Each structure stands twice: as structure tokens, then as C-alpha cells.
Ligand SMILES: Cc1cc2ccc1[C@@H](C)COC(=O)Nc1ccc(C3(c4nnn[nH]4)CC3)c(c1)CN(C)C(=O)[C@@H]2Nc1ccc2c(N)nccc2c1
């Protein structure tokens with residue numbers, strides 16, 4: 233059950249699979265990077281990001 | 289908010305101000321372009337359901353700077369388990385009549401998945417609470433949006449550190465300080481308790497209840513949003529129903 237330990241290394245969501253398998257996922261407005269852990273915005277105003285701080 | 293600071297304009301972009309007949313009622317949290325999460329108790333005394341307004345991009349109540357967006361509240365959804373005048377299940381899901389437009393000053397807070405919130409976010413010690421509530425107990429409310437960083441306690445520790453109060457249930461959590469220096473107040477009710485994790489902010493709590501404001505021996509009590517994720521998600525997939533107030537089964 234990899235997800236209970238340090239979020240399974242996921243930046244956002246973590247799903248446990250049969251065996252030593254884990255899939256990271258992201259909120260809508262983000263895509264998962266090829267590292268399989270990181271979430272990158274796909275939209276101009278993704279949730280939980282503060283534009284005036286992001287643009288700084 | 290007692291003992292916090294002004295939230296610099298645009299740094300709390302998911303904060304919602306709820307108005308009834310143009311008067312300050314409660315706060316709320318924008319979670320996408322059409323949905324706002326607030327506290328069920330904010331609606332106990334409403335008679336004029338058609339005069340409920342949500343304002344996004346608000347900062348200073350004394351001036352209109354053009355970043356404000358006002359929307360009529362089309363629906364207020366409350367869990368069937370909430371009892372008016374009490375504390376448990378203090379959550380409301382509000383559907384705006386028209387979506388807000390996302391801008392640098394209007395951005396949703398992430399509503400997290402339950403597992404992520406219970407396994408990870410629940411262990412992030414400090415989170416931000418905000419609103420235009422009382423600056424002092426029995427004092428004036430704020431003209432500029434205020435924000436405060438508060439630590440979360442395990443419920444066993446909240447009970448031990450507190451000095452005829454209602455029970456702290458599994459649908460709640462304590463956060464704040466027992467030395468009377470810092471707290472959210474009644475005017476902040478419904479506002480966000482926002483938690484940062486790996487570069488993103490998430491909704492973990494709703495300003496709910498307590499005794500006075502920043503009173504010695506008492507912490508602030510917040511609705512434990514993780515218990516409502518499935519409930520909120522199912523409702524957001526639902527079609528609107530005539531009438532503003534809707535009681536929906538919980539779980
Ligand atoms: C649920 C609840 C809320 C509150 C006090 C008690 C209760 C329960 C026990 C009884 O239930 C109630 O008292 N219910 C209730 C229903 C409607 C209203 C509203 C109102 N009433 N008149 N103008 N506005 C907001 C609608 C109101 C309370 C006003 N009010 C005292 C509240 O909001 C207050 N909020 C906080 C929120 C956060 C607090 C914090 N961290 N540290 C200290 C105190 C705090 C008080």
C-alpha cells in the first residue's frame with residue numbers, strides 16, 4: 233500500500249494497484265509528467281495556484 | 289480573523305464573500321467556476337433566498353476596483369444530517385447562477401480526493417484561514433480580507449488542551465491557539481481552511497464554530513471537508529432543481 237507512505241511519491245493523487253503497483257494522478261486542469269509523479273498545469277488558471285505569485 | 293494580517297490582494301483568490309440584501313453574511317471557497325463551499329449554519333436565518341449573492345475577487349469592501357465579480361446563488365445544498373442551530377455536518381454546497389470568469393484575482397481552490405486529504409493533507413500542520421470577520425471579539429469586522437496561519441490538532445489533543453461545550457465529532461477538527469491570540473471569528477464562518485502541499489493549495493476545512501473569538505482555553509472548530517468529498521462530487525454532477533434550498537441525503 234505505497235500511497236499511505238509519503239503520498240506514494242505523488243505530487244497530487246495516488247492510487248494503489250494489485251502488487252507493488254502505484255499510479256499517480258492529478259486534479260482536472262493538470263497533466264501527469266513522464267516521471268509518473270509530477271503534475272503540470274494544462275490551463276491558464278489551475279486550482280490552488282496563485283497567479284500573482286506564479287507570475288513573480 | 290483575530291491576530292492575522294491583511295491577505296495581499298489576489299493572494300486569497302478563491303475567497304468568496306456571501307451577501308444577503310447587500311449585507312455581509314459569511315465567507316465561502318470557490319472550488320471551480322460554478323461551485324462554492326461554505327458552512328450550513330450560514331443559512332439558518334435566511335428568509336430572502338433570492339437576495340443571496342456571492343462575490344469573487346473581493347479584497348477591500350470600501351471600494352470597487354473592477355476585479356470583483358458578483359453572482360446570484362441559484363442553489364444552496366445542505367446535508368440531511370445537519371440540524372439548524374447545532375454544530376455537526378456544517379457544510380453547504382452553493383451553485384452560482386452563472387459561472388465566474390477565472391482571472392488573476394478569481395481562482396478556485398482544489399477540492400482534494402478523500403484518500404489524499406486523509407492520508408497526507410490531514411498531517412500538514414499549518415493551514416491558512418481567511419475572511420472579513422471580527423478583528424477582535426465583540427469588535428468591528430475587517431474592511432480588507434484578512435488571513436491567519438493556524439496549526440491543526442488531533443481531536444484527542446484538542447480535548448486535552450481545551451479548558452457545556454458541544455462534542456468535537458469525526459466531521460470536525462480543531463485548529464488554532466488556546467492562548468487567546470489568534471483565531472477565526474463568527475464573521476469568517478464558511479471561509480476556507482486552505483492547506484499547501486507540494487506547490488498547490490487544497491480545501492481541508494470550513495470556518496465553523498467555537499466560543500467567542502480567540503478566547504483563552506478554546507480552539508477554532510472547522511468542518512472536516514475530507515468526510516464530504518464523495519457527497520460534494522456527486523452533487524456537482526447533478527442537475528439543478530427548482531428552489532434555492534436543497535437538503536440532500538448524507539452520506
Ligand atoms: C455553529 C455555530 C457558529 C457560531 C457559534 C456557535 C455555533 C453553534 C455552537 C450553535 O449554532 C449557532 O450559533 N448557529 C448559528 C447560525 C447562524 C449564524 C449566523 C448569524 N446569526 N446572526 N447573524 N449571523 C451566521 C449566520 C450564527 C450561528 C452566528 N454565529 C454566532 C456564528 O456563526 C458562530 N461562528 C463561529 C465560527 C468560528 C469560531 C471560531 N473559530 N472561534 C470562536 C468562535 C467561532 C464562532
Ligand SMILES: [Ca+2]
Pocket residue numbers: 346347348349350351352353356
Ligand atoms: Ca472591493
